[PDB]
Structure formats: structure tokens, C-alpha cells
């Protein structure tokens, strides 16, 4: 959630969107964890998705 909040302001604040490492300095933790945390956090895709 903390990341979404930053990504919201920083979306228009930066005019593009914060770089994958941008919110990392803003956030307390080791800041490389953005990749790991962002991955497992994703919701699985419906296997019934028509393609």
C-alpha cells in the first residue's frame, strides 16, 4: 500500500512515473526488495482467460 501512495503522487509529480528504484529510496527497507515484493504481490491470472 505504501508504494501505491507514492506511485500516485509521483505519477504526475515526475510527469512520467517513478523509476523502479525511485520509490526504493523513499521507502525505508533495503530498497532492492521492490522487485521481489512487487512480484509475489501480483494476483494470479485466470486460467480461463480467453485469448
Write out the three cell numbers for 7: 506511485
Among 2, 5, 11, 31, binds other proteins (CB under 8 A): 11
Q: Is 9 exposed, middle or buried (0-12, 13-18, 19+ CB in 10 A)?
A: exposed
Binding test (CB under 8 A) with other proteins, winner from 1, 4, 15, 51? 15
Q: Which of residues 17-46 bind other proteins (CB under 8 A)?
A: 19-21, 35, 38-39
Is 12 a binder of other proteins (CB under 8 A)?
yes
Residue burial 18-31, b: 16+ Cβ < 10 Å; e: rest: beeebbbeeeeeee
Residues in contact with other proteins by CB under 8 A are 8, 11-12, 15, 19-21, 35, 38-39, 47
Amino acid at each position: 500500500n505504501k508504494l501505491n501512495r507514492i506511485s500516485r503522487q509521483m505519477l504526475q509529480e515526475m510527469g512520467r512515473e517513478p523509476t523502479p528504484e525511485e520509490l526504493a529510496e523513499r521507502m525505508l527497507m533495503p530498497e532492492d526488495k521492490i522487485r521481489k515484493v512487487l512480484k509475489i504481490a501480483k494476483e494470479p491470472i485466470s486460467m480461463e482467460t480467453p485469448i
